[PDB]
């Protein structure tokens, strides 16, 4: 329950994976009607660490370009030369890509990122335990959503092509 700016009560149903993180740069906008980034049948790249280097972001971009599919990059932060590479490839050639900060401050960030990985069918990169490196990315290590909205303040992922049994096991893990 929160306040409403109107005179009447209204119910909002939020489905899928919505989190209060917008795009990192406004150059990723491709739908000017709502000032939002819109992709359908897009790859998802999940990183538990910051993406600040060229070689940590180029191979995923080559998979996304070779498959002619959009890429959503959800990491702790994307800055430095990788952000410039993303913006340059979006503006010059028209590469479909968007970069979104990860939600959560603490172990909640890791848990929600693993939830996104399970729901989309991807793998979390730059983790403390398994230590998967971002220079070694295979096309099966990326999540697959059918739809994504990235606005100024929030991003939402729809119809992630994750394994249903894995999502059920993660649900029972959260229950216990």
């Amino acid at each position: 329950v929160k306040d409403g700016k109107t005179l009447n009560d209204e119910l909002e149903i939020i489905e899928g994976m919505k989190f209060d993180r917008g795009y990192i740069s406004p150059y990723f906008i491709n739908t000017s009607k709502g000032q939002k980034c819109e992709f359908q049948d897009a790859y998802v790249l999940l990183s538990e660490k910051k993406i600040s280097s060229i070689q940590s972001i180029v191979p995923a971009l080559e998979i996304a370009n070779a498959h002619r599919k959009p890429l959503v990059i959800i990491a702790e932060d994307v800055d430095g030369e990788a952000l410039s590479t993303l913006v340059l490839n979006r503006l010059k050639v028209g590469l479909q890509v968007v970069a979104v900060k990860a939600p959560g401050f603490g172990d909640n960030r890791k848990n929600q990122l693993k939830d996104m990985a399970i729901a989309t069918g991807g793998a979390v990169f730059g983790e403390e335990g398994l230590t998967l490196n971002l220079e070694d990315v295979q096309p099966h290590d990326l999540g697959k959503v059918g739809e994504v909205i990235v606005t100024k303040d929030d991003a939402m992922l729809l119809k992630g092509k994750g394994d249903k049994a894995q999502i059920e096991k993660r649900i029972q893990e959260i229950i216990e």
Partner: peptide
């Protein structure tokens, strides 16, 4: 530009 067709920034 890389082998996969990804353009690189000049200052990098």
């Amino acid at each position: 530009v890389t082998k996969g067709g990804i353009m690189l920034p000049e200052k990098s």
